[model samples]
Target chain A: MDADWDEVTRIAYPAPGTFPRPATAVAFDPIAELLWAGFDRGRVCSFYGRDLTRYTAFKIQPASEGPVRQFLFHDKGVIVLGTRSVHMAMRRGPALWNIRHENMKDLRCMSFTSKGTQEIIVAGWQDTMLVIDVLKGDIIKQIPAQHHYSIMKKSRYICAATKTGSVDLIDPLSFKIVRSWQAHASYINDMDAQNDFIVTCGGSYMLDPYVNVFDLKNMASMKPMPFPPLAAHVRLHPRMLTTAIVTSQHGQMHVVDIMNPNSSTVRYANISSYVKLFEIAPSGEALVIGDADCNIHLWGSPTKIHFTDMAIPIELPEPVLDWSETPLS
Target chain B: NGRIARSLMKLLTILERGDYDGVPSWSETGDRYQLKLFRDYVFHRVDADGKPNLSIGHMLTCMSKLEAGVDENILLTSRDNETVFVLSYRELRQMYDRAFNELVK
Candidate 1:
C-alpha cells in the first residue's frame, strides 16, 4: 500500500477568537511523537498521542510578525521561521534564541547546512542567505542567493525554490549554486526532495494541478502525475521513498507511485473549509492537515500511529495529588 | 507473559470495539459466544452469598491458566441463569484459537 489512513480526528484550537485563527503551518516533531502547529496569532502549540492532547504552547513571535511560515527540527529544539525573524525555543518551553536582520525582512524558510544542525542557512524573497550558527545562537555570514521562496535538505546540497519556478541546488558550505533547473512553469506551490528524486507542483495564472517528478542525479524530468483540482501540496513518503502523496486544497488526495502511476490509491479528507497546511510524520504512520477553520485534522490508524519509531519521552507538569496521609483500603 | 497479556488485551479490545479491524462482528458466532461466556466466568464472579466476589488474584490465576491452556476444569454460567457449562482450560484455549482464527481469516 502506498499510503492509507483508517480514521480522522479533528482537533480544535484550545482558544478561539471572534474570527477564525487559521493554522498557518503544521508539523510532526522529528524526534518525538508530538504534533506541532503554528497559527495566525503566532502561537506554536504541540499535541500528543491519538487523542491530540495539548502538550505545550508559547508565543514565538508577536502577532504583528505575521504567520509562522516554516519549522526546522533539531536535536535540542525547534527553529521557527517567521517573515522578518527566526526564533529557537526548547521543545517544552523557554526561548533559547531569536535573530532578526534587516535583510531577513521576507524570510520564508530555512534548512540545515553541510555543517549539520550546528549551522543553518535561512533564505526567502531576498537575494541574500544568512548563515546562522545555531550553536552560538547568532548569525555568522550572509551569502548571495537567487530570490527563493522555500528550502529543503537533500544530502549535502540544499534544494531552493527560485522566484521563476526553478530549483537551484546549492552547496551549503561554500555557498555556491551548483546546479539549477526549471521544475515548474511559474512559482512553485509545494515541493519535496528525497532519495534521488525532486517532486513539485506549480504553474502560472491558471495553476496546473499536476506534480512534476525530476531526478536529482541527472536533472531529468520524468512523467507528471495528474491532479484534477489544484495540486496544493506534495510530499514524498518518508519510508516509502518512491511513493508520493499529492493533495489538493479541496481535500482530494492522490497517492501515486513516482515511477509508475498505475498502482495508485485515492482518499478524501472530510473537511468543511479548504486545507491550508499539510505535514506528515517522519515514521510515515500519521499525517495532519490544517484547514481554514482553525481546526487541525489528524489522519491515521489509531491502532498503529507514531510520529517516529523511537520517540523521546515528554516532560509533564507537577501533579497536584497529595499523599501525606492517604491510605489504601 | 507481557506479550501474552498484550495479546489478550488486543483481543479484548477487538471484542469491545465489535469488528474493530474492519471485519464483521463475531458476537453472534458460537465460538465467540463461548469466549464471551468464558470472559463472564473469569471476570464476573459472585460469592457464596451471591455478593460480588471480584478479586485481582482470581483474574490473574485464570489468565495464567488460560495462557498455559492447563487441563483444569471451571464452571461457566450464562447471564440469563438458565444455562450452565463445565469446561477445561485447554478446551477454552481451543475455542479461543478457533474464534481468533475465524476473525483473522
Candidate 2:
C-alpha cells in the first residue's frame, strides 16, 4: 500500500506562554499514556490527551545549567532524566536519585540493556560509560570506551556508537568488549538494532552529513538509505521489520520500507514549521513530531491509496479571549 | 536700524523657504520665542524623566487613529539593500503613537 504524506495533522497550542522554545526531547509514556517534553528553559511539561491541557509543570533544579538533553521511560512509574547531571524520578513523583561528577563534564546519552533475568542502564558520559544496576541504583560496572560518546543497548550487549564512527559491543555483566566494528566514516548520530538487523546513522564530522545503515548479521556490512539531503532521526517500527520512519531536520517526516533490497520506497510529509524531535507510537500506527513553533503534529495512516495524496486532518480550538477588564484594582 | 531689520526679515524669509545653509539669522526676541515653543512642545508630551502622563488624551487619540489604520508605513524587506512600505506619513505616525501608548499603559 502506498502512503500519502500530506495527511499529517498539526496540533496547535492555545496559549502563547504554554509552549517552550527549542524543545530538546520528547517521549511517550505507555503507563501514563501522556506525552512529556524537555525544553531549553530547563523545565519539563506534561500534556494529557484526555483533557488536552498541560496539567503539571516541574522546574528542573539548577536552572542556570544547560537543558535536559535526553530522558526515557524506564519501567512502571519511573523516568530516567539526563541533563548535565543524571537523575531518576518516579512518574508524577519526587526525584529519587541523582549523580554528578566534577571531572566528568556532561552526560550525553543513555540506553537500557534487558537480558532474561537482568536489567542494566548504561549511560554515555563525556569520555566513559557507566553501567548502573536498574533496580538497586548502584554502579555495577564502568568501561572506558575511549571516546565512545553514545550508547545503545539490546538484549545482552551494550553498543557504544562512538564519536570516531565505530560501534563497540560491550558485555554489560562482564564489562568486556565482545566485538567492535568501524561502520561509518564520521560520528554516528543515532543507532537502533533488532535481533537480525542493526541500523546506524552517521555523518562526516560536523561538515559532511549522511546516514549509513549497517546490517549486523551480514558481517557488519553497510547500506546507505536514499533519503533527503539533511541530518535526521530514523526510527524502526516496533513490530514490522520492513517499515520505518525518518524525521528530517527541516521538520519533514518520511515513511519508508526497507525490506526490499532492490528498491526502497519513501513517502514524505511536511509536519511543522520547524522540527525538534519525533517519537513513534508503540503500536507503530501513529507518530508524534514536535517542532520549534511549540506545537506537536500527530500523524496516522492515511485512507487514500497513493502516498502523495494522503492527509491527516486535525483542527484545534480557538483561544479563549481575555476580555474582562479591571478597574486598576 | 531700519536696514538691519529688513536684512533680518529677508534672512528669515530665506530660512522659511528651506534655504540658507548656516544658522538662520534671527533677532534675540525671535530666538527667545522659538526656544520657548520648543521647550513647551517637548515638555507638553513627556515629563523630565521621559515619562508620559496618560491623563492627557493626546496619546489615546493617536492610538485610536492607529487602530483605525489612518496613517502607517509597514516595512517589508526581501533583499539586503532596500526595504519597502506602502503606508503614508500619517499612517506611520498613528502606528508609532499606538505602540507608544500601549507601552505606557
Candidate 3:
C-alpha cells in the first residue's frame, strides 16, 4: 500500500457536535491502553486500546472542562489542559487534580518536558508557559514566554509557531529565547523539527499557503517551498525523511520528500473538505489525518458547522513490526 | 450519509408531524419515554394475541386502511402489556438511524 489512499484503514470517530469541529489534538498512550482525542467541545474522548472501540457515549460537556485546546499523555493518565484549567485524568478514573489558571485567559498548547520523568509544560494567552509537577498537582514554574499557536519539541528545547508568522525557540529550564525569525507572510499553521531540518508552513486568504526549511545545525535558510493553500498542520516522519503537508487546497495532503520538497505525492484528498491536521502513529507506521468535519442539515435551514471530526489512517506498504501492540485499524 | 440514511430521516420527520388517534397513552415507568418499534405499527408484547399475528411486512401493508401512513404513529407496549405508549414515530426512526450508523452499516 505504498501511498495507496484507497487501501488505508481508518476508525470512523463520528463524534457529536453543535457544529462540525475538526479534532485539533490527539494523544496515544500505550500505558493507559487508549487513544485520547481532543474532539468536539470541552470534553476529552477516548477509545479502547485493544480494538479502538468506544463503549458508552460520553457526556456533551462535563463541568469545568471547556473545549480542550490540548491533550498530552505521560507515564500515567492524560493531562487535559483547556481554557483556564488543567487536569491529570486517570485512564478509567476521575481527575487527579483540576487546577485552574487564575491569571491566564486563553489556553493554547501543552507538552511534557524532555526529561524521562515528564513534567507538564502548558502555554497560553499571557505569553507564559508553565512547568508543572504531576504528583502534587503543583505549578513548579511559569516562564514568561512569547506568543505561539502550536508547540513542537527538539531535544530539550521548545519550538513553537508564533502568531505573527514566525518560529520561536525557547529554553524551558533557562527561560531564555534561543532563536527567533520571520518565516511566513501569514500565520504559521504548524512546524516540525528533527535531526537536521526545521520546516514551517501557514495559510493566508490574502496570500497562498507557504513553507520554508532551515538547516538545524546553523539556522541557515535553505530554499523555500511553495503551496496553493497550506492547511494549518504538518507531520514529520524522521526515519523516512518524509514530511506530510496538508494542502487544504480542495482537501488534499501531500507527503513530500524532505530534501527535494517539490518531489511529493498526494497522500489523500476529499474535495468536500480540507485536512486540518495530521499525526504520525506512536509506532511510526500509520498516520491519523483530521479534516473539517460537518453535520449539515442540507434540506431546510442548512447549517454547516466545523466541529465534528473523523480520523482516517494512512496505510504504508511496509508491514508494521508491532502491528498487534500499536493496533492501528 | 447515503441514500438509505437520508430516506430514513425523511420518513421520521414526516411521522413526527402526522397525527395519531385511538393510540394507547403512556404510563410512567422509566424516567424518560422509551419507544419500541420492531417492524411496523403494533408495538412490543402481543397486542390482542391474534392481532399481532401479522408480520411487520403485513403491518406496513395494513397501514393505509388503518389511517395516515405506514410510518406514522408507532404503538409501544409496556412490560405488563397494559401500558402501550403512543410514542413519536420520529424517535423510533432515530433508533433505526443510530443502529445503522453505529452498528449495522
Candidate 4:
C-alpha cells in the first residue's frame, strides 16, 4: 500500500498494448467492434477488441502532407483532421477539404458545436474561429474569438475557457458571447463544466493557484480549493459534477471532489502520462494515451481489466556456425 | 465480415502495429485500406495573430503536383532542407495520383 488512493488503482484500462506510435486521437468502432487509434504521423490502426490485435491501417494522403492531430468517429464515417486538411472516410468515398488556404492551421481547438447548427468549429488563430460546412466542403464562416472553447463535454453545453481570466459561456448556435462569470482572476488555463456547475483551475501567475467552482443556474461563486501552479487541462465527471480532475504537462494528476469547493478528500494520482485532451472516457472511465512503446496508457479513473491469457512473442538469437573474428575499425 | 476483409484488417493492423508479418512492405492497398507514401512525415500549420493563416490551398497545391509530371523537379521538404525526387518521377507521380484520386480527392 504505497498510497491510499493508489490502493484503489489497478492497471491499464484497455490493456497497455493498444497503439504503436504516440496516439493523438482514438475511438471505438461500433459496427466493426474494433478500436481505432490515430497517431501523430498520420495513421489509424484498428484493433480487434477481443484480442487487441492489429486489424488494418489506413494511410491517408495527409500522412505525407502533415501531422494527423485528431481522429473522430461520427455515424458511419471517421473524421481525420490535421494541420493541412480534414479527411472524412465515408462509404461512398473519402472526401477532404483544405481549410489551410490561410484562414487556419495547427488547429488548437475544434468541435461540432451542437448548441448552434451542427457545424465544425475550429480555432487556430488567436482571434478567429473557422466554421466549416461539412456537406458543402467550405469554411463557410469566420467568427471573432471570444474565449478559447477547448473541451466538448458529453454533459450539457459545449464550454470554452480561455486566457480571458474568466469562465464565459458561448452560445453554440449564434456563436456569440451569451453569459460569463468571473472564475479566475487573470488567466483561466483550463476548465470543465457539466449541467450548471463549472470547475476551473488557473489564475494570475501568482494569485489563483487554487481551483474554483461556479454554478451557472444559481449564478453563485464557491470557495476555492488550494493547489500549486496552473493546470493546463481540467475535466469533470460526466454524471458526477462534483468530481474533477486537474492535469498539467507532468505525469501526476490531482483528483478532487469540488462539492463544497471548501475541502474534502482530494485523491492524488501519480500516473506517468500526459493528457493531450482534457477528455474523460465514458464518464467515470479513462482516456487512453498512445505511447511510443506500442502501449496505451489510462489517464483518468484507472480502468481495471483482467488479463487471463498473455502471449508475448520472443525472438531467440540464431546459433553461429563459424566464428570469424573481424578486426574492429 | 467476409474472409478477405477479415484477413486484410488483420494484415493492416499488424503492419500499423509496426509488426508487418507478410512481407517487408510499405502499403497494402486492397478492399480494406491503403498504405501511405511515407511515415514520420510531419507538418504544422502557420499561425500568427492567434489565428491560423496558411493558404487553404497549400495542401491541395502540394497534392495537385502528384497528379502530373515527367522528370519533374519536386522538392519534398521545406525551404530549410530539401530532397529532389527526379530519379523516380513517374512512379512517384503515379503514387501521388493514387493518393489524390483515392484518398485526398
- DockQ of every predicted complex: 0.01, 0.01, 0.02, 0.03
Local accuracy of candidate 2 as per-residue lDDT tens digits, A147-254 = 545646363456667777788776656657777777567666666665445566666634224345555556455565656545466777666775666656665455
Candidate 4 lDDT at A323 equals 47
Question: Which of the predicted structures, 1 or 3, would earn the higher TM-score when compared with the native?
Answer: 1
lDDT of each candidate versus the true structure = 0.73, 0.50, 0.51, 0.48
Error of 4 at B89 (Å): 32
- lDDT (10s digit) by residue, model 4, range A210-319: 77877666767777766564565566755466777665544345666776443433444444454443445433434433333434544332234211122222111117
Candidate 3 lDDT tens digits, B6-81: 5545445433222323222111211122322233233222445453343444444333323322345443433433
Please tell me how candidate 1 rates in CAPRI terms.
incorrect
Compute each candidate's TM-score over C-alphas. Answer: 0.70, 0.59, 0.60, 0.53
How far off is residue B82 in model 2, in Å? 44
Best by TM-score: 1
Residue A301 in candidate 4 has what lDDT? 23
Q: Name the candidate that leads on DockQ.
A: 4
lDDT of 3 by residue, A234-265 (tens): 65664465454445534456666657767776
Docking class of 2: incorrect
